[PDB]
Amino acid sequence: ETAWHRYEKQQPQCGFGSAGLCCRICLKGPCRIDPFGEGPKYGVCGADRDTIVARHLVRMIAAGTAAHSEHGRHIALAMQHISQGELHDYSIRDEAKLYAIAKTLGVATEGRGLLAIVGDLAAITLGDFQNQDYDKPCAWLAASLTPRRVKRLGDLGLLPHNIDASVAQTMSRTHVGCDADPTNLILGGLRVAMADLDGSMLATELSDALFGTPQPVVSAANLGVMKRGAVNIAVNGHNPMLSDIICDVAADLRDEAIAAGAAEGINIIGICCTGHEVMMRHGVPLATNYLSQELPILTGALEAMVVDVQCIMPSLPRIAECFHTQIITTDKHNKISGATHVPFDEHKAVETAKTIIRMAIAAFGRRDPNRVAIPAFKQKSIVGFSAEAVVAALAKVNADDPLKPLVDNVVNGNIQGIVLFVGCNTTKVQQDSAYVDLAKSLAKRNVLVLATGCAAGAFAKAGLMTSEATTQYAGEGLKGVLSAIGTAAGLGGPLPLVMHMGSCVDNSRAVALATALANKLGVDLSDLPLVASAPECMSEKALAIGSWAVTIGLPTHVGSVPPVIGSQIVTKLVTETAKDLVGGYFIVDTDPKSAGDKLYAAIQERRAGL
Amino acid sequence: ETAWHRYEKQQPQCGFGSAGLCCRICLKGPCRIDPFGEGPKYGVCGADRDTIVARHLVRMIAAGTAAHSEHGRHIALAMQHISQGELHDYSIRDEAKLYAIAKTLGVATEGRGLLAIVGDLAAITLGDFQNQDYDKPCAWLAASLTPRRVKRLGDLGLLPHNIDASVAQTMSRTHVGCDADPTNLILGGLRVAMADLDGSMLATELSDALFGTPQPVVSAANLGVMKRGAVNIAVNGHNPMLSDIICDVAADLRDEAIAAGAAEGINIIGICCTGHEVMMRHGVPLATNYLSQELPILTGALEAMVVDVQCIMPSLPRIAECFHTQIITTDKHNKISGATHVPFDEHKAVETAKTIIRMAIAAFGRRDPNRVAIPAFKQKSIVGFSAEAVVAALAKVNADDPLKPLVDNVVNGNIQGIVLFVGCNTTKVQQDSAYVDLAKSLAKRNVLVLATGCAAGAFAKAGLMTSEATTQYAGEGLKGVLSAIGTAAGLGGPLPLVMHMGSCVDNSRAVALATALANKLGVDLSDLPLVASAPECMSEKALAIGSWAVTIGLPTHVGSVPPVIGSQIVTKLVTETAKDLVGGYFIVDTDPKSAGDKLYAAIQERRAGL
Ligand code: SF4
Ligand code: SF4
Ligand code: SF4
Ligand SMILES: [Fe+2]
Ligand SMILES: [Fe+2]
């Protein structure tokens, strides 16, 4: 029983829910709203469909914010311990970025010396979680956005002051008998959404400092990245603090495994974000994205799967009980009944990593040799395109103004615009269907493609993160500059039709490049022919990313349809009133083809304004 | 169209929801679970009914925590501004108590200056919102609970370290693909629940400092308390920072109302908690509780209703549009479409209060004289029983050991035990039905009755918060001591059959008295014949109160049935496994009579253990 199966058995899923016409915020419920048939028009409390549809959308964003923030808070606490001599398993693999950061956050570095620079950053970052002054914007946001944007959101009161405080006041204002005005609720949601970005930036930057900002690297994707002769260990989740250490400890045991009868040694494969984290920095091959995370077990060649936080199906234990596979959970706030828990203490990272990998080297000799079945499918992929890497490549075409070439080409027409693919894998859409057709769709129209998360995972497996992939679908105008830069660098040919910018949080990598280009033109993102698209979004996190994408200024496309249609006022606010208030807006459309046209249309419309 | 009407139109409310067998945590949903008919047994993600039922219960608690905490955070920030000279509208009152928090901590007291400590307390309290050390318990909790409890919860990891952080990590661990283990989820819920208490204590104590710890006072309840000769202004919500100032400015504006044609002047009536706040401290009469908050408008004699935060029906504007009544909202995170917004700036409290009251003195001359209709119903009530007041009364019977008499009588049998009534008004139960029958039920069996919130509002209107009320229902044993203390006190006949201990947050007033008695006996609450009951609970806040009531050690009764039955594992954890782990447990029963018997049975069982 797979995810696709379970999905089928759910059919037909509740219509009231899908419409957002249901509310279980209090026990006087569950109240539903009859849109037409003049049945119930209000909740027992008096709440109307507009209110009802609004609070739920908002709480979904807050939850997404809380998911990302918790990822960041973790790394921020790591810096703190580092700048205090603790956690001797983690260092500053890139004092350069650790330095650039300080620069941006107004943190003095001059003759100071690392651990004080590591420490202040930790206090500022952690500050974004403790500030009680509703009017003091979060540091990272105020420091990382075009000054024009900071000025705009600030006047609208859409700039958050505290990540945790934002999630909480969001849940607090949507309690029964609280914030009911549709407009006020949606604005509050846009604000918490900004707290998601803040946490995302905070998390990406500091992550680069701890493990190294990613640079171009070749890798592989899909299940066909599992050695028959190797101990296969999959890492799935979002926190790199564990996976990265595992990759290190893994190599160290390039022997113990061989001993246990592992010819090709230890073969760790990634899944989702944490997988994207190690695939981005190091060569580590990506096994698969969200919906397909169970399929690796069926292979009958997966010794163990180490999971940390979020986007881990609770079904894994069961599916695994059918084989030898071990489902090892690691976080206190992330346990799954059936899995075997091995608390990951960062202060004892390497030590815990070894225990876990050992558990795998053991389960290896317990593997059924006659049940193995590993698809040949092994799509090659070129990943590791951090905002730095991108500017670094543009340097090899103009070391004085790396942005010059990029600016020019968009002005003449070679590059019509840029599409940022972010998002998940919904069952209400074919695995990686929309992603591929939408990418090719716009890439032909001379639109540059950037992708993160599972969306990026899709393109990886699809083979669009390839040099030739560009030579085969990139409309001339685009294909031109694409190959120039690529050649100007160490890759036989052009850049990938799709550039892998990292995990979900790494969407800030895109926000950074965008703001850089935007400042060069002395303009704002709400002016660039920059567009966002989430073809198969599903999670509350995804819903958050999309919301701030819209508040940053980008026209955002969602191909899943959030619980909004049940309310026209709300549907209006987020797809029309947003165009003014904040410049960005949502574009709901479940037809890839239709979406692409609306997207390109927006890119073209943005063009006009320049 | 009233709340009762809207409720009817909702009938029959979804069964899946009621059962907790539905999940809209991500877009791959909404997934529902078919309990029997072997339909869908899992969510498209793999989540099972146990998981599904658990995350929702937890997130409800987190939301409740966020509601209460936000109330506290507000007052804590007020102290901070106070200890800095800003906020020239507010000050202190009753310091002998301000040093009952300025002691309930490593508070540096002795000759240091008040407006210096009304800042240290502010830093500690605010600390409970910023601490990033998962292992450092919140100050107020560690300082206000029996040391035995602190030791117990601490070993179980059920002691929160940061209120806001608790809500957020709660939302984070229940995101799709996160914490799925039923036991782990419920434990995490119990912890966030403790963050609700922390916020509640934090909020009550500091509130007493700012406006005066409540002492016995006589008052009135129910609509009747209104008056055509007066300008009627109702305050509804939870934050006393506004209402209290209004009561002052109200008296002030003398030649302002009478002039406008207001014979009896300005008559401000309360509703819910904020109403309980001013009814507790000052004589301010309570108009009504939750479900009946709209009825005051129909009276046709309500000039205006000033609402701040939470438990304010979104229907008020509409209902009011039929009259002259003004629905004035005041908080940025609490707007209702239709109401007229008047931002309440504390730095300009008195100034804003005057604007609002003026708006009322105006709407007064716009009142329809031929549509007025104010019920005669005006039940008298004796309220203001803070934990202090209770010990103060017990002093007048033994100034050496105020607790002595109280301890003794429970040991001999005069007082079988104590029931704490907390909770709301659900439509799935008659207005204040269960409350009254359950109160009399146990009071006959010699059980002392304490009540807060709307539950307490009920008893107020019912007339059980009366001296004679005791002479008429209190079983001898109880009735005995009840009258002794009452007589010994400077009031009149025996104490009220039901003692009003304040608003929802003031449930800590009860936790305080309980812990005091518990320490005297050198025992824990999980040992006292102390029991909690929420006959008509409805809100996420109520669900939180109940959860920590259970974690503190009390056997808690809920008469609404949270979305739990759909899961036996969960139902088990919170009503059986809790008996061990933490000593308290839930007692779900929708039949007042049946409930009372189980309650008294638990009180009796607790007795046995002593
Ligand atoms: S969304 Fe609401 S109405 Fe639909 S199944 Fe879930 S609880 Fe029931
Ligand atoms: S908050 Fe209002 S609409 Fe939602 S369940 Fe409660 S009564 Fe119904
Ligand atoms: S989290 Fe799981 S059970 Fe809940 S809606 Fe999503 S797929 Fe369904
Ligand atoms: Fe992710
Ligand atoms: Fe309340």
Asked if omega into B240 is within 30° of 0 (cis), the reply is no
Rounded Cα gap, residues A188 and A547, in angstroms: 11
Q: Which residue in this structure is represented by tokens 């609002």?
A: B356
How far, rounded to the nearest angstrom, does the alpha carbon of residue A286 sit from its chain's CA centroid?
A: 15
Phi and psi torsions of B103, nearest 5°: 180, -35
H or E segment and range at residue B232: strand B230-236
Closest Cβ opposite residue B44 in set A6, A64, A165: A6
Cα dist. A409→A6, A7, B102, B562, B586 in Å? 48, 45, 66, 60, 67
Classify residue A348 by burial, with Cβ atoms within 10 Å: 0-12, 13-18, 19+: middle
Contact B174 A63 (CB under 8 A): yes
**Extents of the domains making up chain A:** 36-210, 211-379, 382-609
Q: Which residue in this structure is represented by tokens 């990265």?
A: A244
Contact B40 A10 (CB under 8 A): yes
Identify which of B16, B33, B49, B55 to mutate to test ligand 1's pocket (most ligand atoms within 8 A of the CB). B16
Rounded Cα gap, residues A547 and B92, in angstroms: 43
Rounded Cα gap, residues A31 and A21, in angstroms: 8
Whether A171 and B64 have beta carbons less than 8 Å apart is answered as: no
H or E segment and range at residue B17: helix B15-19
Closest-CA residue, ligand 3 atom 2, reads: B45
Structure tokens at B46: 């793999």
Whether B256 and B361 have beta carbons less than 8 Å apart is answered as: yes
How far, rounded to the nearest angstrom, does the alpha carbon of residue A105 sit from its chain's CA centroid?
A: 23
Whether A278 and A235 have beta carbons less than 8 Å apart is answered as: yes
Rounded Cα gap, residues B252 and B506, in angstroms: 29
Q: Which of A544, A551, A563 is nearest to A61 (CA)?
A: A544
Rounded Cα gap, residues A422 and A509, in angstroms: 12
Rounded Cα gap, residues A114 and A126, in angstroms: 18
Q: Chain A contact for B588, CB < 8 A?
A: no
Contacts of A178 in chain B (CB under 8 A): 67, 309-312, 333-334
DSSP β-ladder status, B22-23 and B31-32: antiparallel
What CATH class does A211-379 carry?
alpha beta
CA torsion through residues A383, A384, A387, A392, sign: negative
**Residue B295 one-letter amino acid:** L
Whether B236 and B307 have beta carbons less than 8 Å apart is answered as: yes
Rounded Cα gap, residues A304 and A288, in angstroms: 15
Rounded Cα gap, residues B399 and B403, in angstroms: 9
Query: Which phi-psi region, left, alpha or beta, contains residue A563 (left: φ > 0; alpha: ψ -120 to 50)?
Result: beta
Three-class HEC string of A259-277: HCCCCCEEEEEEEHHHHHH
Structure tokens at B471: 């002479």
Whether B478 and B496 have beta carbons less than 8 Å apart is answered as: no
Q: Calculate how close chain A gets to B506, using CA atoms only, in Å.
A: 18
DSSP β-ladder status, B340-341 and B326-329: parallel
Closest Cβ opposite residue A314 in set B14, B180, B560: B180
Residue of A nearest to B33 (CA): A10
Contacts of B355 (CB under 8 A, 6+ apart): B342
Rounded Cα gap, residues A93 and A87, in angstroms: 14
No. of helices (H) and no. of strands (E), chain A: 26, 16
Please check if A454 is assigned to a binding site. Answer: yes
Radius of gyration over every alpha carbon of chain A, rounded to an integer in angstroms: 24
Contacts of B411 (CB under 8 A, 6+ apart): B610
Give SS3 for B542: helix
Concatenating the DSSP letter of every residue in A416-482 gives -EEEEE-----TTS-TTHHHHHHHHHHHHTTEEEEEEHHHHHHHHHHT-SSHHHHHHHS-HHHHHHH
What is the CA(A482)–ligand 3 centre distance, in A?
A: 40
Q: Calculate how close chain A gets to B171, using CA atoms only, in Å.
A: 5
What architecture does CATH give domain B382-609? 3-Layer(aba) Sandwich (3.40)
CA torsion through residues A259, A263, A264, A267, sign: negative
Contacts of B253 (CB under 8 A, 6+ apart): B266, B354, B357, B358, B361
How far, rounded to the nearest angstrom, does the alpha carbon of residue A84 sit from its chain's CA centroid?
A: 30
Q: Tell which atom from ligand 1 comes closest to the C-alpha of B15.
A: 8
Domains A211-379 and A382-609 share a fold: yes
Please check if A322 is assigned to a binding site. Answer: no
Contact A426 B27 (CB under 8 A): yes
Contact B539 A175 (CB under 8 A): yes
Whether A356 and A246 have beta carbons less than 8 Å apart is answered as: yes
Cα dist. B339→A179, A407, B329, B334, B381 in Å? 12, 49, 6, 11, 32
Whether A603 and A416 have beta carbons less than 8 Å apart is answered as: yes
In the CATH scheme, what is the code of domain B36-210?
Answer: 1.20.1270.30
Q: Which of A425, A65, A173, A337 is nearest to B172 (CA)?
A: A65
Whether B387 and B501 have beta carbons less than 8 Å apart is answered as: yes
Structure tokens at A306: 């180490």
Structure tokens at A194: 């900004």
Helix, strand, coil abundance in chain B, percent, nearest 5 = 50, 10, 40
Contacts of A505 (CB under 8 A, 6+ apart): A68, A71, A72, A199, A200, A203, A204, A207, A238, A273
DSSP letter at A255 equals T
Q: Which of B578, B579, B570 is nearest to B181 (CA)?
A: B570
CA torsion through residues B255, B256, B261, B263, sign: negative
Ligand sitting nearest the alpha carbon of A240: 4
Please check if B504 is assigned to a binding site. Answer: yes
* Other residues' Cβ atoms within 10 Å of the Cβ of residue B396: 15
Question: Does residue A32 line the site of ligand 1, with CB under 6 A?
Answer: yes
Q: Tell which atom from ligand 3 comes closest to the C-alpha of A538.
A: 6
* Other residues' Cβ atoms within 10 Å of the Cβ of residue A391: 16
**Residue B33 one-letter amino acid:** I
Q: Which of A316, A228, A229 is nearest to A272 (CA)?
A: A316
Rounded Cα gap, residues A515 and A287, in angstroms: 33
Contact B6 A165 (CB under 8 A): no
Phi and psi torsions of A599, nearest 5°: -65, -60
Cα dist. A22→B10, B23, B268 in Å? 11, 11, 36
Contact B39 A428 (CB under 8 A): no
Helical ranges in A466-587 per DSSP H? 467-473, 476-488, 507-520, 540-552, 568-572, 578-581
CA torsion through residues B549, B551, B557, B563, sign: positive
Residue of A nearest to B17 (CA): A30
What is the CA(B31)–ligand 3 centre distance, in A?
A: 6
Q: Chain B contact for A10, CB < 8 A?
A: yes
Closest Cβ opposite residue A311 in set B24, B164, B176: B176
Vertex A131 angle, CA A126 and A133, to 5°: 160
Rounded Cα gap, residues A64 and A198, in angstroms: 13
Contacts of B24 in chain A (CB under 8 A): 17, 22, 56, 563
Closest-CA residue, ligand 3 atom 3, reads: B43
Q: Which of A8, A10, A65, A187 to probe the B interface (max B CBs under 10 A)?
A: A10
What is the CA(B26)–ligand 3 centre distance, in A?
A: 5
Whether A368 and A323 have beta carbons less than 8 Å apart is answered as: yes
Structure tokens at B404: 């002595």
Beta bridge partners of B340: B328
Helical ranges in A1-48 per DSSP H? 3-10, 15-19
DSSP letter at B104 equals S
Contact B73 A132 (CB under 8 A): yes
Query: Which phi-psi region, left, alpha or beta, contains residue B48 (left: φ > 0; alpha: ψ -120 to 50)?
Result: beta
Q: Which of A128, A171, A431 to probe the B interface (max B CBs under 10 A)?
A: A171
Vertex A449 angle, CA A447 and A452, to 5°: 155
Q: Calculate how close chain A gets to B521, using CA atoms only, in Å.
A: 36
Give SS3 for B598: helix
Whether A456 and A500 have beta carbons less than 8 Å apart is answered as: yes
Concatenating the DSSP letter of every residue in A156-223 gives HT-S-S-HHHHHHHHHHHTSTTS---HHHHHHHHHHHHHHHHHHHHHHHHHHHHHH-----EEEEESS
Rounded Cα gap, residues B451 and B457, in angstroms: 9
Cα dist. A441→A446, A592, B24, B490 in Å? 9, 9, 32, 84
Contacts of B580 (CB under 8 A, 6+ apart): none
Classify residue B283 by burial, with Cβ atoms within 10 Å: 0-12, 13-18, 19+: middle
Separation of first and last alpha carbons in chain A = 53
Whether B535 and B453 have beta carbons less than 8 Å apart is answered as: no
Cα dist. B60→A58, B51, B177, B539 in Å? 15, 14, 19, 9
Three-class HEC string of A384-428: CCCHHHHHHHHHCCCCCCCHHHHHHHHHHCCCCEEEEECCCCCCC
The residues lining ligand 3, judged by C-beta closer than 6 Å to any ligand atom, are B 23-26, 28-31, 43-45, 47, 52, 176
Vertex A169 angle, CA A167 and A171, to 5°: 70
Contact A177 B561 (CB under 8 A): no
Interior/surface letters A66-99, b for 16+ CB within 10 angstroms, e for the rest: bbbbbbbbbbbbbbbbbbeeebebbebbbeebbb
How far, rounded to the nearest angstrom, does the alpha carbon of residue A533 sit from its chain's CA centroid?
A: 13
Give SS3 for B551: helix
Whether A260 and A207 have beta carbons less than 8 Å apart is answered as: no
Tell me which residues of chain B, numbers 525 to 584, contact chain A at a CB-CB cutoff of 8 Å. Answer: 537-541, 543, 560-563
Contact B45 A314 (CB under 8 A): yes
Q: Chain A contact for B179, CB < 8 A?
A: yes
Please check if B537 is assigned to a binding site. Answer: no
Q: Which of A1, A45, A295 to probe the B interface (max B CBs under 10 A)?
A: A45
Vertex A544 angle, CA A596 and B33, to 5°: 95
- Identify each DSSP E strand in A308-374 by its residue range: 326-329, 340-341
Whether B250 and B357 have beta carbons less than 8 Å apart is answered as: yes
Closest-CA residue, ligand 1 atom 1, reads: A17
Concatenating the DSSP letter of every residue in B252-302 gives H-STTTTTTT-TTEEEEEEEHHHHHHHHHHS---EEE-STTSSHHHHTT--
Cα dist. B337→A50, A184, B271, B505 in Å? 10, 9, 20, 28
Rounded Cα gap, residues A53 and A570, in angstroms: 7
Radius of gyration over every alpha carbon of chain B, rounded to an integer in angstroms: 24
Concatenating the DSSP letter of every residue in B296-324 gives HHHTT---EEEE-SSS--TTHHHHHHTSS
Phi and psi torsions of A147, nearest 5°: -60, -25
Rounded Cα gap, residues A184 and B330, in angstroms: 13
Rounded Cα gap, residues B96 and A564, in angstroms: 54
Residue of A nearest to B541 (CA): A175
Helical ranges in B337-386 per DSSP H? 349-364
Rounded Cα gap, residues B312 and B462, in angstroms: 22
Separation of first and last alpha carbons in chain B = 53
Contacts of B520 (CB under 8 A, 6+ apart): B403, B407
What is the CA(A55)–ligand 4 centre distance, in A?
A: 24
